[PDB]
Amino acid sequence: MIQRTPKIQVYSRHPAENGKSNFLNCYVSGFHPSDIEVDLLKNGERIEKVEHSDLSFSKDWSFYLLYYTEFTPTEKHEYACRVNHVTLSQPKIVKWDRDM
C-alpha cells in the first residue's frame, strides 16, 4: 500500500479567448489513495457551483485533480481551497494567493 499527501495550489487564470472572465483554480496533485474531498470556499463557505472537475492519474498510485470555476474576485472576500484526505488529520485550507 502507499499513501501520499496531496500538494495543493490555488490560483486564478483568464482564458486567452476571453480576458474578462476569470477562473479560480485548485490543483490537487500527487495524492494516493484517490479518495478525496475538495471544495472552493468564499469567506469560508462552500461554493456550490464548480463547473469543472478533471481527474487523472500517472502511475497507478498518483492522482491529479483540477477543480475550477468562473468567478469575479473582489478585495472584500477571502477565497480558498479546502481539502480532506486520509493523509490529513484536519481539513487543509489553502488561501488563494492573489499573485497567481
Author numbering: 0 to 99
From the study:
To strengthen this hypothesis, four mutations were inserted at position 76: D76A, D76E, D76H, and D76K. The last three C-terminal residues (residues 97–99) are the only stretch undergoing some rearrangement upon mutation at position 76. The side chain of Arg97 presents different conformations, and the strength of its interactions with the EF loop and to Trp95 varies in different mutants; residue Met99 interacts with Ser11 or with Arg12. Such observations suggest a role for residue 76 in determining the interactions within the EF loop and with β2m C-terminal region. A saturation site mutagenesis (D76 to E, H, and A) allowed us to show here how position 76 is indeed crucial in the β2m fold, any mutation at this position results in a notable decrease in thermal stability and a remarkable increase in aggregation propensity as observed for D76N.
The D76N mutant is strongly amyloidogenic and, in contrast to the wt protein, aggregates efficiently and abundantly without seeding and under native conditions. Indeed, the 76 position is located in a solvent exposed loop between β-strands E and F. A detailed analysis of the interaction energies of the ensembles reveals that D76 is at the center of a network of stabilizing electrostatic interactions that are lost in the D76N mutant.
